[PDB]
From a paper:
Cytochrome P450 enzymes (P450s) are a superfamily of monooxygenases that utilize a cysteine thiolate–ligated heme moiety to perform a wide range of demanding oxidative transformations. Within GPA biosynthesis, P450s function in a specific, stepwise manner to install the essential side-chain crosslinks in the core peptide in a process that typically requires one Oxy enzyme per crosslink to be installed. Given the apparent preference for the unusual heme orientation shown by OxyA enzymes, we investigated the OxyA homolog from kistamicin biosynthesis (OxyAkis), which is an atypical GPA. Structural and biochemical analysis of OxyAkis has shown that this P450 enzyme is highly prone to oxidation and can display an atypical heme orientation in different protein batches.
The tyrosine residue at position 99 (position 119 in the His-tagged OxyAkis protein) is oriented in such a way that the phenol moiety is very close to the site of additional density present in the OxyAkis structure (distance from the phenol to the site of damage is 3.7 Å). As the phenol group present in Tyr99 appeared to be appropriately positioned to play a role in potential oxidative heme damage in the catalytic site of OxyAkis, we next cloned a mutant in which Tyr99 was mutated into Phe by site-directed mutagenesis. The addition of H2O2 revealed that the mutant enzyme was slightly more stable to oxidative damage than the wild-type enzyme, although the mutant still exhibits the shoulder between 600 and 700 nm and is more sensitive to oxidizing agents than OxyCkis. To examine this mutant further, OxyAkis-Y99F was crystallized under the same conditions used for the native OxyAkis. These crystals, which are diffracted to a resolution of 1.8 Å, showed a mixed population of heme orientations in the enzyme active site (6:1 normal orientation/flipped orientation). Interestingly, no additional density has been observed at the β-position of the heme moiety as had been previously observed with the WT crystals. We observed weak and somewhat distorted electron density for the mutated phenylalanine residue itself, suggesting that the side chain exists in multiple conformations in the structure. Furthermore, it appears that residues 223–228 of the I-helix now adopt two conformations above the heme moiety. In the wild-type structure, a network of hydrogen bonding is observed between the Tyr99 phenol moiety and amide backbone of the I-helix residue Leu217, mediated via two water molecules. The Tyr99Phe mutation results in the loss of this H-bond network, which we then attribute to the differences seen in the structure by permitting both the increase in flexibility of the Phe99 side chain and further the second conformation adopted by the I-helix.
Author numbering: 6 to 66, 74 to 162, 181 to 384
Amino acid sequence: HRVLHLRDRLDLAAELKLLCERGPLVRIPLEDGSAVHWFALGYDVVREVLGSEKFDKRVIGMALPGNLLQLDPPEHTRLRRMVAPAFSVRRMQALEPRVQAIVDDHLDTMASTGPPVEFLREVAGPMAARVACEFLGIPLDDRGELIRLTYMRELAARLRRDPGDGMLGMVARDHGADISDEELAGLCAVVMNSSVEQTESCLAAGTLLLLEHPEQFALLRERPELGEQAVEEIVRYLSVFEGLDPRTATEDVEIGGQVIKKGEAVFCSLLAANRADPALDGFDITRKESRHVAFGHGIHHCLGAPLARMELRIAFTTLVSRFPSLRTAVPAEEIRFRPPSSNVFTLLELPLTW
Ligand code: HEM
């Protein structure tokens, strides 16, 4: 369903805009009669689908342990409840100064190398990866290699036998016998993946978005208290996680005024839900409350959202303050974005100068 990923730079492609005009829930019977699929395109219907207990995440026509996105209740609940305490408000507050210092480290490297910089590979990527290591509690001597590769079972088993700090230590200390080596390794892999894919892309493309709106780049500098609002507006506008794994109805269920039959698959487009409403779509960090589903909704709602929200706030606020003269080293119109795919949305490189 490639149409759900068609963009014009950061905005929706006309072809996808045209599709959204067909209403927030669109029935898509396959041309071969093999199935009936649905596109959930509106904010309310996407929330209705994702909150419903009447859908599962069955495979339809690689499964890895510790991957919450491939579990349904009650197994999903069992694993999620064991890892959830790593993201409490208490734990992000304890972690904030150390994340601030990691961000400052990478912006120190940037200011010393001097311009230009390829911001994606040289700043955003490493920053996101290093924050992930700190959150996870990766031992210092493993971080360089772990990041270079993005082994995991060997790493997870060793840390499990001697709990450290961070999320992995907490999990092994409090649930050592209830989580296997492969499941702990799977958690580690998802966190690294979500950091070097989703978070890195938000950092790089969000910097571009701010640079394309220099009034707001500067506003965040003069009013850093806007950081939290800025993050919500950035993740809404970017929608780097564009479309979700299908939800299959386990029984007939009425959604958005239509009957989704047992066995039919619903594809939620976060991109469309976040962007298709022309009314209030303009990028504006002074919006006090953003209407978006950039982190999903329901039992699979992004487990890392507290970390992502804190890391992005720290990164963007510090960046605009330390580099008021930042600008793209090429015209914004020349930036390459990855072509339509179910993979995370990202630009391919971001040359910056200052
Ligand atoms: C800007 C960055 C991020 C965005 C936009 C994002 C987005 C999302 C979305 C939309 C989902 C729901 C997928 C679905 O329901 O099919 C999700 C799930 C998840 N995310 Fe994030 N994510 C981000 C960063 C992170 C980070 C930093 C972590 C670190 C732990 C993380 C861990 C997870 C996990 C484990 C799940 C699965 C939860 C479950 O199935 O119960 N993500 N993410």
